[PDB]
């Protein structure tokens, strides 16, 4: 489940330039997906780190 | 192949004479609006035209017996009313015909200045006037 | 740093709204800060100070300014919320840039939506540009650096 | 835009009042903006932020200024409401113009009526024009562009 | 108008008080305006705006200023009200004049009486004129033009 | 008047306190004014205005300033009230003078007593005179002219 | 006086604290004033004024400023009160001096103790002296002259 | 002193946070002051003054400013408190320095933690440095000198 | 081994003639940002570059019969629109070829100034123009 | 027994030539902090030293064919980065050796000014530069 959702979220960056201004946007998006899963109780750990 | 000189000219202002000693202030001016957005690669601004302005016009002449034309025009001011006139200024050729013409819309007098008197003042008494207006067009064909 | 960076070179990007280059350019950005609400208590016998306790983390609204743009996608999004109560929150990135135009530092703004839209007064006697202003509410932000 | 437009060239038109050219010319227009009232809530266990919810859309009054005109149709309309409580709301259009004097963008102001009318103080020792000011209440506006 | 009038030429006249030329001349006049008090209501199901309703028409006090005059009839009238609670309301006319010294427009002020009287502070180290100020309450006004 | 008088030539005199020439000279005088408190009422069916009614006449305190004088009789009088609650009200006359040093107009201040006394701050780095200030409460005043 | 004295030459002395010459020198002194609290009453039938009655005499805190001194006795006294709630009130004399450096006039400040102590902000980009400020509460004062 | 010290040379050090030279340098420091809360009481028969009593000692927050630093240890500490409610108080020393770069005087700040963090607004049309600001709450301070 | 003189030059501005009497204002300028942290051993500030500026350019020429080029360019201003041009200024050698070139981006005219007239004005009538622009590059190879 | 003259000197600035027409601005300045306590017998203030300042340095030279050293240094500015240099200015003796030396730390160029062109400008075209810096030391042994 988690892999499919992330895969779809990253389609919007497929034809973007491959540089720092894209790398940072991809990271922010993935982290937002995962923080929600953590709050929901799927992921283990006291804090996101 | 030669430029024009600056001493042969005439002024039509609705008075009885067209000869003047000095004419100045025939200028045009536009304001500038500047802009820069934070993401621009250049660290300077882009410029475009704003609103427009005009300068006042100054006319100078010698004082003559029984000629009170400047005062009489000034004295037409009555609260917010004044006689407005079309002012035509022209640079002349050797046949005394126009070459370059400055056309001025809606002029009226802002101030009238008299001469100063001196015991040893061995010179001509010169009076002057300053005019407000609403626009200038330059013709040179 | 040894020589700290200046503040006049930055980029605003939106996620969930169709991109156009004219919606990424802004005159000014403000509101990237935070505070903690506290409460006080006096303990009998302790006369040197009162105790203070944290309660909540608080964030201000994000404010963006620019010259008026007539075909903006961001404004169409604002209108759906303003006129019909259709709300669909977005994420946003604020980037502070270096001389190679790459980020020095960024801010990740989470779950934002429009609360305000205005255009400054017209004046027949002044030479000025028409300026537009948009204000957004959001839940929190994180930083990457 | 690439070069954003200036704000000094515009037109105000009224629907439901006899037209005269002298009632379409104004020195200044203000009040074309909007905001959303919200409420806050604290959820137990969530210590990162408070929740915020929208409640209502809000608009300010529209304000118009010009030099004093003695035979205005707009003022006769204002007087009927002010003096006799006869109210008959009108619609209005605000137009921002381009160099061909055609609209860049317009605002559609819906169901407006007069709430205020005044003239600025007289002063025997100052050279000034007499200025008139009119304020209108309305329900909402839409834009066309 | 095409060229709007200026505001520095005007006349104040009183009805019910013996006339003197020195009581018709003033440095400044203010307070010729009006407003409407309103109330708000939220209708369930209508989320685009709140309703607004008129309640009352409201007028500010009329304020007059001039240099100190010692034998004024207007001041004797003010004193009877101030010192003995003898009140006898008057009517008043404010005239804005043209270049022939005839009215452009006038204001009819109805049923006025004195509520305030003062003279500005004295200062041994400044070169200034002694200035007097009078404020009147009234019911309403009408205009003629 | 035709040419109104200036405000820089005046005299303050006290009744009930031993006279000294140095207690009649002041830098500034203020507080010679009055106002009327009112109440409002809305009458059902009358929508053009609210009614207003007078209630009371009101006067501000009288304020006097001068350079510091060490042997003043007025200050000894102020101290008896300030330090011991011994109150003994006085009357006072304020005179506005003409070029022959005779009164143009006077004010009769009735039943006054001290409520305040102060001296302005000292500053080692400024060149200034030490200034004293006295404030008095009174019941009413009358004018003679 | 005929020529009133200036305010830039004065001395502050303390009783109950070990003396040092560096604790008698100050940049500025303020707070030497007093006022009387009053109450109002309306008597039925009397419409010319309201009655006013005195209740209490009131004094402001005394404020002293100077450049920072590290070994001050006055500050050690302030610290005992601030840190441990050990309070031991002192008396104080403020002297305004003449050209022979003798008092023109003095103020006797009775039963004073510390309520505040601070030092102004540091700024790496400005050329300024570090300034210290002390505020004292007291019961009353008397004057000698 | 005979010549008091200036305020532009100082050092801020932290205990409990890994040291880096770039976290000891600041543009400005403020908040090193204190006050005492009091209460009032009126005693019947005593009309010269009201009594005042101390209740509590009070301190303001400590405020630090500098140019933006991206890898700061102090900011990482602030983030743990801001984002996760993990609080771990620290001690701090403020040093005012002499010409040999040794302390003239120091302040011992006890049990501090972060309550605020912000960065000033960006502006595309101005030449400015990005400035960061941090505010800390603490219990009390002591001085050494 | 010798420096260049300053009197032989030409200006390309989109008009019909390239001869001018006077050219001035070819400047470049940068702002300075200053800083000092309280703990520094030095009691002065450190400096770094800020945003950039450019000066306006002034051109002067003699008035000629049937030449109204200055007015016509100025008169292309229409609210926020104007004809923008590339301005090239060049210092010439003995073969009348470029030596030093100043390249100016996006220029338009801010103001046009006419001459003053005098009865005893035994001189040439000189008109002038002031131009706004967005950037300058200097080439000397 | 005689003072030094002011016309024989050289400047080392990292460029290809050390000859200049004019050098100015080699100044040092300190601020003053004033104080007076109310009890003092004197009615004037006591003074002590504050923070320090430096002036900008101006250099002037003639324009030469294929020498674009001023522009090239200026053009190294990139947002907040610039090439900084050590500037050494020296007054020379009859053997062309240093006598008095001014040592300048961290200089960079603030502005570059070009020449004005004139039809009757019978003179040398002179360019100039203004430099920012962080400190000056004077050596005279």
Closest residue in H to I31 (Cα) is H127
**Secondary structure of chain D in the HEC alphabet?**
CCCCCECCCEEEEEECCCCCHHHCCCCEEECCEEEEEEEEECCCCCCCCCEEEEEEEECCCEEEEEECCCCCHHHHHHHHHHHHCCCCCEEEEEEEECCCCCEEEEEEEEEEEEEEEEECCEECCCCCECEEEEEEECCEEEEEC
What is d(CA E22, CA D127) in angstroms, rounded to the nearest whole number? 23
Q: What is the DSSP letter of F27?
A: S
Q: What angle do CA D83, D86, D89 make, to 5 degrees?
A: 120
What is d(CA H10, CA G136) in angstroms, rounded to the nearest whole number? 29
Contact indicator for B61, C137 with CB cutoff of 8 Å? no
What is d(CA C114, CA C82) in angstroms, rounded to the nearest whole number? 8
In terms of DSSP H, where are the helices of chain J? 69-74
Given phi > 0 = left and psi -120 to 50 = alpha, else beta, which region is F31? left
Quick one: tokens of C81?
């919320």
What is d(CA D6, CA C119) in angstroms, rounded to the nearest whole number? 12
Contact indicator for I49, I30 with CB cutoff of 8 Å? yes
By C-alpha distance, which of I113, I115, I118 is closest to I130?
A: I113
Contact indicator for E83, F54 with CB cutoff of 8 Å? no
Please count the other Cβ atoms lying within 10 Å of the Cβ belonging to residue H37.
Answer: 12
| Burial tier of D135 (Cβ tally within 10 Å: 0-12, 13-18, 19+) | buried
What is d(CA J118, CA J112) in angstroms, rounded to the nearest whole number? 20
What is d(CA E107, CA E11) in angstroms, rounded to the nearest whole number? 11
Residue whose entry in the numeric block shows the structure tokens 């400023």: G65
Quick one: tokens of J23?
């050098």
Residue whose entry in the numeric block shows the structure tokens 């006890």: H110
Q: What is the DSSP letter of G6?
A: B
In this complex, which chains have at least 3 CB pairs below 8 Å with chain F?
A: E, G, J
Question: Maximum Cα–Cα distance for chain C, whole Å?
Answer: 68
Residue H36 phi/psi, 5-degree rounding, is -120, 120
By C-alpha distance, which of E129, E128, E101, E131 is closest to E119?
A: E131
Beta strands B57-62 and B22-24 are antiparallel
Experimental approach was cryo-EM
What is d(CA G23, CA G16) in angstroms, rounded to the nearest whole number? 13
Contact indicator for F29, F9 with CB cutoff of 8 Å? no
**Residue H43 to chain I, least CA–CA distance (Å):** 52
Q: Does B3 touch chain C (CB under 8 A)?
A: no
Contact indicator for G70, H105 with CB cutoff of 8 Å? yes
Residue whose entry in the numeric block shows the structure tokens 């505001």: E7
**Residue D64 to chain C, least CA–CA distance (Å):** 10
Question: Hey, is A25 helix, strand or coil?
Answer: helix
Give CA separation, E28 vs D67, E68, E106, E134, I110, in Å: 19, 13, 16, 11, 43
Q: Does I114 touch chain G (CB under 8 A)?
A: no
In terms of DSSP H, where are the helices of chain A? 2-9, 20-39
Contact H8 J51 (CB under 8 A): yes
Q: Does I35 touch chain C (CB under 8 A)?
A: yes
Q: What is the DSSP letter of E76?
A: H
**Residue B26 to chain I, least CA–CA distance (Å):** 6
- Which residues, other chains included, contact H40 with Cβ-Cβ below 8 Å and sequence gap of 6+? H50, H51, H52, H53
| Burial tier of B57 (Cβ tally within 10 Å: 0-12, 13-18, 19+) | buried
Residue A24 phi/psi, 5-degree rounding, is -65, -35
Beta strands F131-137 and F62-67 are antiparallel
> Please, which residues bridge with residue E124 across strands?
none
What is d(CA D30, CA D10) in angstroms, rounded to the nearest whole number? 12
**Residue H60 to chain I, least CA–CA distance (Å):** 22
What is d(CA C21, CA C11) in angstroms, rounded to the nearest whole number? 11
Find the helix packing angle between A20-39 and A2-9, rounded to 10°: 150
**Residue B88 to chain I, least CA–CA distance (Å):** 14
Quick one: tokens of B124?
């001509």
In this complex, which chains have at least 3 CB pairs below 8 Å with chain G?
A: F, H, I, J
What is d(CA F26, CA J46) in angstroms, rounded to the nearest whole number? 36
Q: Of chain I residues 44-103, which have a CB less than 8 A from chain C?
A: 46, 48, 50-51
Residue I112 phi/psi, 5-degree rounding, is -125, 120
Q: Which helix (H) or strand (E) holds I21?
A: none
Contact indicator for F24, F81 with CB cutoff of 8 Å? no
Task: Give J50's contacts in chain H (Cβ within 8 Å).
Answer: 6
> Please, which residues bridge with residue C116 across strands?
C135, D35
Beta strands J28-35 and B85-92 are unpaired
Task: Give D4's contacts in chain B (Cβ within 8 Å).
Answer: 35
By C-alpha distance, which of E142, E141, E83, E82 is closest to E113?
A: E82
C to B contact (≥3 Cβ pairs closer than 8 Å): yes
Q: Of chain F residues 41-70, which have a CB less than 8 A from chain J?
A: none
Q: How many helices (H) and strands (E) does chain F have?
A: 1, 10
Contact J51 G127 (CB under 8 A): yes
Question: Hey, is A24 helix, strand or coil?
Answer: helix
Q: What angle do CA I111, I115, I118 make, to 5 degrees?
A: 155
Contact indicator for G106, G145 with CB cutoff of 8 Å? yes
Contact indicator for H79, H40 with CB cutoff of 8 Å? no
Quick one: tokens of J102?
């001014």
Positive or negative CA dihedral for H69, B42, B50, I70? positive
- Which residues, other chains included, contact D24 with Cβ-Cβ below 8 Å and sequence gap of 6+? D11, D12, D13, D14
Contact indicator for D95, D103 with CB cutoff of 8 Å? yes
Contact indicator for G65, G27 with CB cutoff of 8 Å? yes
Beta strands I126-132 and I136-139 are unpaired
- Which residues, other chains included, contact A14 with Cβ-Cβ below 8 Å and sequence gap of 6+? none
Contact F85 G48 (CB under 8 A): no
Contact indicator for D137, D110 with CB cutoff of 8 Å? no
Quick one: tokens of F16?
């009930």
> Please, which residues bridge with residue F96 across strands?
F10, F105
- Which residues, other chains included, contact D36 with Cβ-Cβ below 8 Å and sequence gap of 6+? C81, C82, C114, C115, C116, D54, D55, D56, D57, D58
Given phi > 0 = left and psi -120 to 50 = alpha, else beta, which region is J95? alpha
Residue D12 phi/psi, 5-degree rounding, is -115, 120
> Please, which residues bridge with residue D109 across strands?
D92, D141
Q: What is the DSSP letter of B77?
A: -
- Which residues, other chains included, contact J27 with Cβ-Cβ below 8 Å and sequence gap of 6+? J54, J55
Contact indicator for G117, G133 with CB cutoff of 8 Å? yes
What is d(CA G90, CA H145) in angstroms, rounded to the nearest whole number? 25
Q: What is the DSSP letter of C129?
A: B
By C-alpha distance, which of D145, I87, I129, G121 is closest to C76?
A: D145
Contact indicator for B130, B110 with CB cutoff of 8 Å? yes
Residue G21 phi/psi, 5-degree rounding, is -65, -30
Contact indicator for D42, D108 with CB cutoff of 8 Å? no
Task: Give B33's contacts in chain H (Cβ within 8 Å).
Answer: none
By C-alpha distance, which of G77, G141, G74, G136 is closest to G110?
A: G141
Q: What share of chain G is helix, strand, coil (3-state, %, to 5)?
A: 10, 50, 40
How far is residue E33 CA from its own chain's centroid?
A: 9
> Please, which residues bridge with residue F90 across strands?
F112
Which of G68, G80, G87, G131 would best serve as a mutation to test chain H binding (most H beta carbons within 10 A)?
A: G68
Q: What angle do CA J106, J108, J111 make, to 5 degrees?
A: 155
CA atoms within 13 A on the CB side of I8: 10
Header resolution in angstroms? 2.8
What is d(CA H144, CA C86) in angstroms, rounded to the nearest whole number? 62
Quick one: tokens of H41?
């009481």
Contact J36 F122 (CB under 8 A): no
Instruction: Find the CB nearest B37 among C25, C126, C128.
Output: C25
Q: What is the dihedral of CA C61, C66, C71, C74, to 10 degrees?
A: -20
In terms of DSSP H, where are the helices of F37-145? 73-84
């Amino acid at each position: 489940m988690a892999e499919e959702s992330i895969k779809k979220a990253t389609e919007q960056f497929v034809f973007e330039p491959n540089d720092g201004n894209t790398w940072v946007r991809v990271r922010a998006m993935i982290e937002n997906f995962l923080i929600l899963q953590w709050r929901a109780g799927a992921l283990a750990g006291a804090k996101p780190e | 192949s030669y430029p024009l000189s600056k001493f042969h000219f005439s002024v039509e202002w609705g008075g009885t004479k067209i000869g003047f000693t000095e004419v100045s202030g025939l200028d045009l001016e536009t304001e500038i609006i500047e802009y820069r957005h934070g993401a621009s690669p250049e660290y300077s601004k882009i410029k475009m035209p704003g609103m427009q302005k005009f300068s006042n016009i100054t006319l100078k002449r010698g004082t003559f017996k029984s000629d009170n034309e400047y005062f009489q025009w000034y004295n037409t001011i009555n609260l917010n009313k004044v006689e407005r006139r079309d002012l035509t200024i022209s640079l002349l050729n050797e046949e005394h015909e126009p070459v370059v013409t400055w056309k001025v819309k809606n002029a009226w007098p802002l101030k009238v200045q008299s001469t100063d008197l001196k015991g040893d003042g061995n010179e001509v008494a010169i009076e002057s006037m300053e005019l407000a207006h609403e626009g200038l067009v330059i013709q040179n064909e | 740093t040894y020589y700290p960076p200046s503040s006049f070179h930055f980029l605003v990007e939106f996620t969930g709204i169709d991109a156009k280059n004219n919606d990424h350019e802004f005159q000014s950005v403000s509101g990237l800060s935070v505070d903690i609400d506290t409460e006080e208590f006096a303990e009998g016998g302790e006369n040197r100070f009162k105790h203070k306790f944290p309660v909540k983390t608080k964030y201000p609204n994000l404010v963006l300014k620019r010259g008026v743009l007539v075909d903006s996608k961001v404004i169409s999004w604002c209108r759906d919320a303003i006129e019909d109560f259709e709300f669909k929150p977005i994420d946003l990135t604020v980037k502070l840039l270096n001389e190679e135009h790459q980020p020095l530092m960024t801010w990740n703004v989470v779950h934002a939506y429009p609360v305000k839209w205005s255009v400054e007064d017209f004046n027949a006697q002044e030479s000025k540009m028409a300026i537009e202003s948009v204000e957004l509410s959001y839940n929190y932000f994180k930083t990457i650096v």
